[PDB]
C-alpha cells in the first residue's frame, strides 16, 4: 500500500511525456539481482533501505526542487520517510557475512550513474523525465510491487 502511494505521487510529479524524450532514453543498469527472489525479502531489508534513502537524496537536491512541484515533492518525502521508519523499526526489533554491503554499493553506483546523467544532460526537462520514469521502474522492482 505504501509502495503504491509512493508511485502514485511520483506519477503525479510528471510534467512532460516520455514520448517527447525518446532520444534521451538511457540504460542506467539497475542491479536487479541484488534484490534476489521474493522469498528472501528479510535479507533485502538493508538494500531496500539504501534504495529508498538514495531516492530521497536524489529528489531532495536543489536541482530537484527546481524541476518538480513543491507540494507533490513534500508528499513524496513524507511517503519515503514512512517507508524508512518501517524498515528501521524492524531492524531495531542480522547474520549475513557481507551484511549485503556489496549490494548496497551496487545500489549506490546505480544512483551515481543517474546523478552523472543529470549533470551531463544539464538537468534538462527530458533528462528529469527519463530519471523519473527510471525510478518508477526500479522502485516497483525493488519493492516487488
Amino acid at each position, epitope marked *: 500500500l505504501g509502495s503504491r502511494r509512493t508511485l502514485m505521487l511520483l506519477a503525479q510529479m510528471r510534467r512532460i511525456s516520455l514520448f517527447s524524450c525518446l532520444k534521451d532514453r538511457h540504460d542506467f543498469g539497475f542491479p536487479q539481482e541484488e534484490f534476489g527472489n521474493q522469498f528472501q525479502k528479510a535479507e533485502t531489508i*538493508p538494500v531496500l*533501505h*539504501e534504495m529508498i*534513502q*538514495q531516492i*530521497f*537524496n536524489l529528489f*531532495s537536491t536543489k536541482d530537484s526542487s527546481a524541476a518538480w512541484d513543491e507540494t507533490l515533492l513534500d508528499k513524496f518525502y*513524507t511517503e*519515503l*520517510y*514512512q517507508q*524508512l*521508519n518501517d524498515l*528501521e*523499526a524492524c*531492524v*531495531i*526489533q*542480522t547474520e549475513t557475512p557481507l*551484511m549485503k*554491503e556489496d549490494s*548496497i*554499493l551496487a545500489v*549506490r553506483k546505480y544512483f551515481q550513474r543517474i546523478t552523472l546523467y543529470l549533470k551531463e544532460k544539464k538537468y534538462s526537462p527530458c533528462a528529469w523525465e527519463v530519471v523519473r520514469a527510471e525510478i518508477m521502474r526500479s522502485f516497483s522492482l525493488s519493492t516487488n510491487l
Partner: single-chain antibody
Amino acid sequence: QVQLVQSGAEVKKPGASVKVSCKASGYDFSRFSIHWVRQAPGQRLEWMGWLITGNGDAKYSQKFQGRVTISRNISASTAYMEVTNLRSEDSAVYYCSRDPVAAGLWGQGTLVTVSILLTQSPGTLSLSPGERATLSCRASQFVSSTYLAWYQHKPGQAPRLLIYGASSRATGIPDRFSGSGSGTDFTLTINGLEPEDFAVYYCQQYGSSPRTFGQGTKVE
C-alpha cells in the same frame, strides 16, 4: 510546518522523578516512532529508548531498564519520557527525535539539572578557514553502510544532521561535506573550511539496537 517542541528545563532533587514532554506538529503523529537520547554536559550522546506512537510498544536501552517509562498522548500529539530515582549523573540535555534519520527531526532539548563502540577520532582539532578537516569514525562491531549518520552538534542546540546513510547530504547541507565510509572504518570529509563550519560533529549508527554514537570531533 513540521516541529518537535520539548518542555522547559527542570530542576529536581535526588531520588525524585522527572517527566519531559515532546509536542509534535505538522504531521500525523501516529505514522512515526519517537526516540529519546540524552547528553550530559561536555559528554557524548546516549540513546535511552524508542516508542511506536501507533500501538504503544516501547524498547529501552539496558542502562535505563526499570528507571524509564516512555508514553504518549495521541489526542495532544505529545510523547513523554519519565525518569525515576534521579541522581547527579542524570544531569543532562534530553532530546526527543523522530524515527526517519534522513528527516533529521529533533527537539530543542531539555536540561534536567539534578542537585557498538563508536570511537570518533580525533577528539579535537584546530584549523583556519580554507582547509580540509579529515574527521574519522570507527566501530567495534560491523555497521552497515546504510546505517551511518553525521550530525553538526552546535552548542546547546539540537544536532543538525548533515550526512545520512554515510554518503547522502540532508536538505540544506552544502556540497562541501563529502562524507564517505563503509563497514567498520568510516570518514567525514569537509572540502574547504567555511567560517561557520566550526562545531563538534557526531557519528551515529541506527542499525542494530541500541543506537550508539561517537565521542565527537571538535572543529575550531
